[PDB]
Design a protein around this nucleic acid. Structure first.
Ligand code: MG
Ligand code: MG
Ligand code: MG
Ligand code: MG
Ligand code: MG
Ligand code: MG
Ligand code: MG
Ligand code: MG
Ligand code: MG
Ligand code: MG
Ligand code: MG
Ligand code: MG
Ligand code: MG
Ligand code: MG
Ligand code: MG
Ligand code: MG
Ligand code: MG
Ligand code: MG
Ligand code: MG
Ligand code: MG
Ligand code: MG
Ligand code: MG
Ligand code: MG
Ligand code: MG
Ligand code: MG
Ligand code: MG
Ligand code: MG
Ligand code: MG
Ligand code: MG
Ligand code: MG
Ligand code: MG
Ligand code: MG
Ligand code: MG
Ligand code: MG
Ligand code: MG
Ligand code: MG
Ligand code: MG
Ligand code: MG
Ligand code: MG
Ligand code: ZN
Lengths: 96, 156, 66
RNA sequence: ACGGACCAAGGAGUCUAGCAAAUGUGCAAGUGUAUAUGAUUCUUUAAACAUUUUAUACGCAUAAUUAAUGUAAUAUGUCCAUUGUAGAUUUGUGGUGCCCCACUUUGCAUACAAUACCGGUAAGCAA
RNA sequence: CCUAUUAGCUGGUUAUUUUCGAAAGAUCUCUCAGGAUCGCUGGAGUUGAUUAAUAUAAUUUUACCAGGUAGAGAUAAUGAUUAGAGGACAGGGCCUUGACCUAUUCUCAAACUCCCAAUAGGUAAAAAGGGCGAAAUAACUCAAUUUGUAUUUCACUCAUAUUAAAUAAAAUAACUCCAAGUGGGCCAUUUUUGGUAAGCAGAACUGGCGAUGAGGGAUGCUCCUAACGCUUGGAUAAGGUGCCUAAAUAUUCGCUCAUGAGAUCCCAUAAAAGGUGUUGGUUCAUAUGAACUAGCCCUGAAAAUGGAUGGCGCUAAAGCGGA
RNA sequence: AUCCGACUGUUUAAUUAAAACAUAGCAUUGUGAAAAGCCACAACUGGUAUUAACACAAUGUGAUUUCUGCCCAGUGCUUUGAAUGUCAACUUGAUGAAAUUCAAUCAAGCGCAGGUAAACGGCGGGAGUAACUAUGACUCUCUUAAGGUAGCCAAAUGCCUC
RNA sequence: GCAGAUGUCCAAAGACAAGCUCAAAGAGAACAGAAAUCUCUUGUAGACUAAAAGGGGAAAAGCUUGUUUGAUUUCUAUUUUCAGAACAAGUAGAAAACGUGAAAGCGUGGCCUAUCGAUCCUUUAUAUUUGCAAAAUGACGUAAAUUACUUACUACUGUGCAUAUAGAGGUGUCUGAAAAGUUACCACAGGGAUAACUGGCUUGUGGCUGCCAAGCGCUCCUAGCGACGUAGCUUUUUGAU
RNA sequence: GGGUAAUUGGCGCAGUUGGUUAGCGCGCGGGUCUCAUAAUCCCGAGGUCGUGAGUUCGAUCCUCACAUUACCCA
RNA sequence: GACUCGUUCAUACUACAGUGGAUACACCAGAUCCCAUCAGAACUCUGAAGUUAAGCACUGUAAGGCUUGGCUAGUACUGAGGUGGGAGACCGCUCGGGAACACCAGGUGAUGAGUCAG
């Protein structure tokens, strides 16, 4: 799968028209230490009881979905669009 | 594993007949349909849009919705102790004006004039159809020369 | 250890115990998702008809009492 | 295939909490006198009787919807009580025997739909 | 002592008559000896019909629709497959052979098809409707303030007492509520998969057994007749009429003799191959030869306690095929 | 005459008295002390210990005779350390209004570099070739950390096997 | 049971329009021959269309060109499996903004039938929509007024956290627990719903008995045998259930 | 997922020191003399894990491999 | 006598032959301009010297195919009943339904709306 880095398409934020967008790949981002769930888990793990929550081990998949990140160039607002799961994926390459 | 897909078991049902392949005729697109008409569902496999499901091939229903190139049909279907109404949405190439109703219409149009005349001359006529029944006696004339005698055949 | 795994013996005997039921054959159905731009117009038509009918009814109630 | 040598006595779907459906009873936009207090109540009575000398204890119901700040059911032209199809009962004529028919009058309950309005969300416009 | 700990698993669970009456399928499940959920059952209550009507129907008729199974085909396509015939790349030196082509020829297919049944399915057969003519509303549609299309009114008119084809102890109907038990099945005729087969394993449509007794099959959960309040008479079904055992040693035609006869659904075993036993029939040869055919009988035909047309027995049948 | 155990000794009270256990002999390991080795205790304190390497503690094998081969790649145990990668709390700085956020620093352990088999254990295939056949001293070739040595055998250890 | 396939692949192999016609065969042309390039004649698809198999396709759904990003944002009526519950995969439409084409039209991924995932938690996006429990934080902003606790106006107001709505990170035992062995020292509740004997149905395998006649028997089918085939019996083998 | 190191010629290694941006031993081909071997001296070729900079480089996020130690709520 | 737009989608297709030219449909004469190629072959644009040679229309052929009827044949199969026959494998009877190849014969079209010419 090869995808170009720019794309003219419909904008759904602040200008309901076709304009020019930029295309990249979305990344997960790191879990932050002060979120409510992580504080709950960290307080539960203290004391004298061993592990308190499940830990997954039966991995089966070998790919991930490839959600794209668009961004209007007139207004600077951003939107997500998802694709089908694949193995190799390039953002801007040589044509066939 | 079991294989219950959408088009399973349609090898002979969904294929064109002999020396009759090709897409539909131009007059197919001039048919007139209204709300409440009777209609037949016959799948045409040369058009892959608006394809009806396997079961509803060869069934008859009534129209409840008309669109640009589609028709909604009300069809009965039996489910294990009851009959459920289904709403089938197909494209216009898989739709045919039903012919199951024509005897009723011809009968009404024809009997109207008979009633009009009968009341005109103050008469008592019957218009209900008649079951076929027994025959009256007749005298059948045949010369003795035309009767032929037959008997069982010997085995060879 | 092994047992039966499918049959439909007896099934339509139970089915015909309480007959094969039919749909109820109502007079009107709901035009909720059906053809727009044709039923909105029908709403306008029926509003006009109702306005005329009620204007006549009010008028008659106005004369009859003098 | 397992239990049973014989006889008499004993021997197993109950009680409490909390919810619902069904049915009987009382009152009804309300209903239930809580804990207490009162009395010429006091063998029975640990029962029964009473309620503080334009009248704010509390529960359930009388209004919904939204995470939420909150907002909240035709609308003043008429105390009137949205619209249609079928339909119980009533009103006026005729037909065959108070009953059933053909018109006429009214239109419960309910079934199928339409419309208006209230809370949330989209869309359009926005001090 | 906590403690009468817990058990999806064994065992038990106490008066009468009367009325209705099942499931052993299906979806999900750390699910396969369990459970929830739908289906099948009981009770309660309204709305209807009581007008030989309408609603209605495991049924027909009339009109119309969809199909690729039994059969068929091989010269029509695909894939298999035997043999000659007739024609214009190799073969030693204008002929082997196999080629290539053109008409034929013997034989085939769950996963082949030019064609194509019988059974089995689906829609329709008139009044809350149909037909016809005028108007009124619309922000829809159209080149159209009439182009059309829905709706709203008004006028006219469509069989009915025989009921828009037949038949109907068709309203014993329709709907809502609250709940029980069940979720190991098996068997028979017909179709049918694996297996050499099996009282084996797995499916389909009906009817049964389970949950059910009475007459018959000697005997027997499933075969035949037939389903059940207490009686008195009458006349039968399925099967029987020599005795056991109620009723014919009945009548009227043929066949059979067995030094291991035979005696009827399920059902309780028998074959290939032979006979100069006897009874009928069909052909070829100067009233004699030959070939063939099919009825009863006989040979093929060997197991363990003493035994089984149910027993006795039965041959001018009490055996087999008819009336 | 063969097999096992060297011998006297011990054992499953009530189905096994033995080839099983112990034993003398042999070998290996830890420890110079009240801040040590090995072990007990909740703490405070104890056992060996009225002891001191000819000692105390932890294991294998099992009289005498004759012997005790090769392998440190795997898993254990063990030795060296600021040249050295990773690896906590604390501490120290930077920024910020502050909570946070970020960066640095010689702990032990692993890694890096060595020892050790009377530690756990382990210890190969295919072809050709000698004047009748047969065999293969000899040769070629894959290949391991090392390729079963001295001995012994159809053995209480060999399927085929009577 | 039978013969197989799936956990992928594609900025084009997605969209639209135009022009064109494929496999193969025959006969001809310098090197050139069985196979190189070129001309003609026949050609109903014998080619091609990502991947199993089935269906479809000839001024096209195939080949080549030109322009593109409808593989886009929001909502409904519904089909398949079915309890007529969720996912998932489809069909018919409506409100926006676009592409292609002269135009009618066509386009909400791949000519159709497979190619996939709950609660809780985390992560990035959107908003003139909200909260952090007695209050304030843009800002004393603008206009007045004074002898200050003066007055009237304002969509847009600290860090951090929470919350609504939309994608994503995964459960293949795929309606979704965080999980290694041994018992020849053994325990309990049960099961003939289920194995290790006899008995019962079957008789493949084991054992025994037949039919036909190529041939063996110097010569001679049948004294004694009997190839290639073919019909049975038994329950002193072993299987199957 | 975190930290560190390294990837350059036929092999093995230096350059990471921006206004010079590429080097050496084994190699490879020709003379030198080597009782038939030998220290041998001149030369010719041989390239930076991949895409963009307030720039003249080896200076940036990321991405593919390799090694070591350590981490784990869908 | 001809033409344009359609319907049926082979009785309309295929091979080989014979006949025809008022108008009309074609073949045809050219490349400046719109346009198009390696190539004015095709496509596009401008014409009016020549011809029925071909396209096209109408006919023929013990023509192939297609299409309708007869026959194959109450044959092959099959719904219901049977205390029917037979060791079986299989096969009749009662009440019902009913094919396909092959072979023989006849045919080779018909039609809607509008227009031109003598
Ligand atoms: Mg189908
Ligand atoms: Mg028991
Ligand atoms: Mg007992
Ligand atoms: Mg109540
Ligand atoms: Mg409360
Ligand atoms: Mg408001
Ligand atoms: Mg303003
Ligand atoms: Mg107990
Ligand atoms: Mg009953
Ligand atoms: Mg055949
Ligand atoms: Mg059970
Ligand atoms: Mg019975
Ligand atoms: Mg018997
Ligand atoms: Mg009697
Ligand atoms: Mg008898
Ligand atoms: Mg008697
Ligand atoms: Mg003789
Ligand atoms: Mg008798
Ligand atoms: Mg001893
Ligand atoms: Mg010794
Ligand atoms: Mg002793
Ligand atoms: Mg003992
Ligand atoms: Mg002893
Ligand atoms: Mg010992
Ligand atoms: Mg010792
Ligand atoms: Mg080591
Ligand atoms: Mg260290
Ligand atoms: Mg040796
Ligand atoms: Mg040996
Ligand atoms: Mg095709
Ligand atoms: Mg095209
Ligand atoms: Mg395509
Ligand atoms: Mg599971
Ligand atoms: Mg599951
Ligand atoms: Mg264990
Ligand atoms: Mg059993
Ligand atoms: Mg046998
Ligand atoms: Mg000519
Ligand atoms: Mg012909
Ligand atoms: Zn924008």
């Amino acid at each position: 799968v090869n995808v170009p880095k720019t794309r003219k398409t419909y904008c759904s934020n602040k200008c309901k028209k076709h304009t020019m967008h930029k295309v990249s790949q979305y990344k997960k981002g790191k879990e932050r230490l002060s979120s409510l769930g992580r504080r709950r888990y960290d307080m539960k793990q203290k004391g004298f009881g061993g592990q308190t929550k499940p830990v997954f081990k039966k991995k089966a998949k070998t790919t991930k979905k490839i959600v794209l990140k668009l961004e209007c160039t007139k207004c600077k607002k951003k939107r997500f669009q998802t694709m089908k799961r694949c193995k190799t994926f390039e953002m801007g390459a040589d044509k066939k | 594993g079991k294989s219950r897909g959408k088009r399973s078991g349609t090898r002979y049902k969904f294929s064109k007949k002999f020396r009759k392949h090709g897409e539909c005729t131009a007059n197919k697109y001039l048919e007139k349909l209204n709300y409440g008409d009777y209609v037949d569902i016959v799948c045409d496999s040369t058009q892959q849009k608006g394809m009806p499901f396997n079961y509803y091939h060869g069934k008859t229903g009534k129209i409840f919705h008309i669109t640009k190139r589609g028709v909604g049909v009300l069809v009965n279907k039996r489910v294990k102790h009851r009959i459920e109404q289904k709403k089938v949405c197909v494209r216009i190439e898989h739709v045919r004006k039903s012919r199951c109703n024509e005897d009723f219409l011809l009968r009404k149009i024809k009997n109207a004039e008979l009633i009009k005349e009968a009341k005109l001359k103050n008469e008592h006529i019957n218009i209900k159809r008649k079951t076929e029944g027994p025959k009256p006696a007749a005298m059948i004339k045949v010369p003795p020369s035309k009767i032929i005698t037959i008997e069982p055949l010997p085995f060879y | 250890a092994k047992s039966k795994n499918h049959t439909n013996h007896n099934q339509n005997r139970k089915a015909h115990k309480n007959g094969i039921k039919k749909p109820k054959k109502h007079k009107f159905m709901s035009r909720k998702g059906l053809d727009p731009n044709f039923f909105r117009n029908q709403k306008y038509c029926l509003k006009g008809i109702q306005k005329k009918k009620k204007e006549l009814k009010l008028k008659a109630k106005q004369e009859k009492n003098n």
